[PDB]
Enzyme design. Sequence first.
Site, PDB file in Angstrom:
ATOM      1  N   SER A  37      -0.630  15.638 -12.022  1.00  0.00           N
ATOM      2  CA  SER A  37      -0.883  15.283 -13.406  1.00  0.00           C
ATOM      3  C   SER A  37      -1.122  16.539 -14.226  1.00  0.00           C
ATOM      4  CB  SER A  37      -2.092  14.339 -13.483  1.00  0.00           C
ATOM      5  OG  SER A  37      -2.510  14.102 -14.812  1.00  0.00           O
TER       6      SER A  37
ATOM      7  N   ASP B  39       0.831  -1.196   0.000  1.00  0.00           N
ATOM      8  CA  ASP B  39       0.000   0.000   0.000  1.00  0.00           C
ATOM      9  C   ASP B  39       0.871   1.254   0.000  1.00  0.00           C
ATOM     10  OD1 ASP B  39      -1.929   1.908   0.287  1.00  0.00           O
ATOM     11  OD2 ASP B  39      -2.422   1.413   2.382  1.00  0.00           O
TER      12      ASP B  39
END
Length: 330
Positions: A199, A35
């Site tokens: 992004s 994770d």
Amino acid sequence: STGSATTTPIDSLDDAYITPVQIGTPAQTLNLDFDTGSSDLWVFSSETTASEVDGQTIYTPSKSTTAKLLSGATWSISYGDGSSSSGDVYTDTVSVGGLTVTGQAVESAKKVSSSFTEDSTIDGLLGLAFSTLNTVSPTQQKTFFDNAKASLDSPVFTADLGYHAPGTYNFGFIDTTAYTGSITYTAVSTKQGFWEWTSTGYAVGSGTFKSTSIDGIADTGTTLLYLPATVVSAYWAQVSGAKSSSSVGGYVFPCSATLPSFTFGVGSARIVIPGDYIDFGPISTGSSSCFGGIQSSAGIGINIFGDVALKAAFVVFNGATTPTLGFASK
């Protein structure tokens, strides 16, 4: 040193991925959920409340000659999906794919919430976010990666998740046969303890690319792709009959649909998520309403590039003095 381990979807939807991990002496092999959105290595154990164990393999520290109680240390964690676990702590030897760390904090669960109990395939979590998020008190502990780092050939790990198929976590090297083209690296902020990056925009299907900054985290422990409501609405508007359902808890779409792809930007590069990756199947067994793999982050407080996005790429988690993230197509 290096390590290399195969990671395998837990079910037919790729809800999560498990990777075998050797703990203790002699080895006890547990299948852990790696994770990159948390920083605790915790396991089902001989200390876990019996009624909360249902099929998991447990770590038994009393059977490990290298286990030592970390005296006074406790831990307690709550995840974004509302699940939780807590307990005490041992140090022991932990190996992943041939890479060994001695003195790793192994957090032994005394209690786990129902979602963990109900997932018989996940024996615990191995956190790979920054150690500043580790929950051990009163002495915060380091992640497996942080502990291994100085011994690694290169201070990196990579995630290469499969779509309905096994993939690989590598530690200490970049497998240049595992991706196509070049790797594009992008800046990381560690201020919130995550692999947080920005992004450069998105496209829906064959549509034009929208240049827009989207701050989010690379999180292998989250199944879906969670993005701003504007972006998600633009995606689902291209699927006939798709709608957001408060009763279901997000966007659903007719199972008869063919889903468009979704592209996200990494610098001037582009990662394309095929439409099929965005299908999470019937909302309930036999339903003709299907659950979407792109959902709104509104009210989460952060955008999350979960498995839906990451499995479309070869992803480098670069833990050099200035951390960065790399993405390549594959």
